[PDB]
């Protein structure tokens, strides 16, 4: 039985922490996984202060190369804009891009404007003031999120871009997913981005959003993973699933990335986190849907076995998996 410790993204923290929780169970070995945002995540394995980091946003070929790391896909989840509009239920309100982008650079200031009435025709909006909220922490949500938006609002992409940290416009900061969702639940007239889970989990409402082809979607498990059948992983794994064509492609989602050192100094660490993720992939499948995260197609998985033994190795070159 193993001990090991990760850390990073909150994004996929409730799949994670689930399958850390039947892993111990079944074999006794034991994950730590600290949420502590994407830009904690990468900073702690690069300190190898933790057995693996987790982030979002993917780091580039160039980038792994300089630090000797090696990433890898788990799961698909989705970006869902949480709201607390009284009067208002879940799945109800719907927004596209532009509109979502004018919100959030502070241009709409309350819920019966124009703009979201004429997406909302038969919805009788409050006249409520819009309170925004964003990471305060350096997020890979923030990331997928400011990627989102730049795409579908010029003003966004040109005066605050993309980032896992940005200049927000407006809106109080809130740390991590947990803090956003807790947010927004205690402040009426709220809308935070927050993955899927954690507006379920939090029995908090959210929004429709218009997909990249034009027609409203709800953010379900299979919308996440609509949004990814067109990404050819074959190759890359650093897919960008915002704003997908497609069939009910919900238009906020991503994967998300393990990250792990090339050369394993405690390769018996190294050995069980391999290990743990196999598993996962093997077995968690249903874990993950019980979250709403999609699992990864099957083709994936062999590509991302046939690297940890192509990529992973203990000092003496000798290949871990
Ligand atoms: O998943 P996050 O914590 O990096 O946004």
Redesign the pocket.
């Known amino acids: 039985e193993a001990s090991l410790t990760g850390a ?5 923290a409730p799949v994670y922490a689930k399958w850390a929780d039947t892993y111990q169970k079944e074999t006794g070995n034991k994950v730590n996984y600290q ?1 502590i ?3 904690g ?1 990468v900073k702690q394995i690069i300190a190898n202060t933790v057995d693996f980091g987790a ?2 946003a993917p780091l580039s070929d160039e980038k792994l190369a300089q630090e000797g790391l090696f990433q890898f896909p788990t799961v698909i989840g989705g970006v869902v804009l949480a709201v607390n509009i009284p009067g208002l239920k879940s799945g109800e309100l719907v927004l596209d891009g532009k509109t979502l982008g004018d919100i959030y650079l502070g241009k709409i200031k309350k819920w019966d404007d124009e703009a979201i009435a004429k997406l909302n025709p038969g919805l009788k909006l409050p006249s409520q003031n819009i309170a925004v909220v964003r ?1 305060a ?1 350096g ?4 990331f997928v999120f400011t990627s989102y938006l730049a795409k579908v609002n010029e003003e966004w992409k040109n005066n605050v871009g993309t980032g896992s940290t940005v200049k927000w416009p407006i809106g109080l900061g809130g740390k ?2 947990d803090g956003i969702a807790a947010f927004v639940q205690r402040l009426p007239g709220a809308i935070g981005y927050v ?1 899927y889970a954690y507006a379920k989990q939090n029995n908090l409402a959210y929004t429709k959003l218009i997909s990249a082809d034009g027609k409203p979607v709800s953010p379900t498990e299979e919308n996440f993973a609509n949004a990814a059948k067109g990404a050819d992983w074959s190759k890359t794994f650093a897919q960008d699933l915002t704003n997908q064509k497609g069939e009910d492609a919900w238009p906020i989602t991503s994967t ?1 990335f393990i990250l792990i050192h090339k050369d394993q100094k405690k390769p018996e660490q190294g050995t069980e986190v391999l290990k743990f993720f196999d598993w996962a992939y093997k077995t968690g499948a249903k874990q993950a849907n019980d979250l709403d995260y999609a699992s990864l197609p099957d083709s994936v998985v062999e590509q991302v076995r046939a690297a940890w033994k192509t990529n992973i190795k203990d000092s003496s070159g000798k290949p871990l998996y």
């Open positions: 990073g993204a909150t994004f996929p949420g945002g994407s830009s995540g982030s979002n990471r922490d997020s890979g949500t923030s991590g997913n993955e998300t």
